[PDB]
Amino acid sequence: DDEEETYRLWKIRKTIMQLCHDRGYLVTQDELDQTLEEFKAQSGDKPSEGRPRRTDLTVLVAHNDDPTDQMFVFFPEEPKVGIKTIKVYCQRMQEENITRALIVVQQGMTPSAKQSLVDMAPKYILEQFLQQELLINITEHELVPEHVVMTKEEVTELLARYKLRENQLPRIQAGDPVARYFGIKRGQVVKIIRPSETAGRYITYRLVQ
């Protein structure tokens, strides 16, 4: 004990940061291969480590298009999050004037918060995850084919090729694990590249709805 806990911390940090890399934010290559002993060097053993503050991270920005667009990652400590803690996060958010942040829960939170997660503000969006999910990166799994989100121009071109109206495309559920991983809202279109049994390849498209 305190070595399994640190192992979990290491793995969840790896996964969250990989997710942020995949969404296209600033991240440094030397962090990617941060080893568990490297984590032990940067962060001490569990009894000396303050969970709700040690792992918080906000260096990530949307450098791909806007270095001035920053985001947050938070690691609450209480088994179930309460209204006070999300208010503390949101007021910290207002002090830093940022629009997006990530939430991780060890077990869950109050239903009152669940209701609140839909109505913070149109300009403030908060995404909820569970510790027992990000402990593995679903994108690395063998049954998950490569998803690649694509811009408005690419979709324009695609549905110009087949003479489609966008609603004739097959759907991907808004709440699906991979869609929620990539953080794509309604009306976006995703390209799937399926691995054939042979060297060939098949392509298909789905609409987020």
Partner: protein, 50 residues
């Protein structure tokens, strides 16, 4: 009018017309048939490069 697949079965080929195991052709068997039906005694034999 909504799409189910973009191409039938990923290949577009017809399951009833498969001479192989879900692959339309067996190359060794088609070649040998060509060799046996068209013996061309005049032509010289080919080499790796040719």
């Amino acid at each position: 009018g909504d799409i189910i697949q973009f191409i039938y079965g990923g290949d577009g080929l017809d399951p009833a017309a498969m001479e192989g195991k879900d692959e339309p052709l067996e190359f060794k068997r088609v070649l040998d048939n060509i060799k046996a039906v068209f013996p061309c005694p005049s032509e010289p034999a080919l080499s790796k490069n040719e």
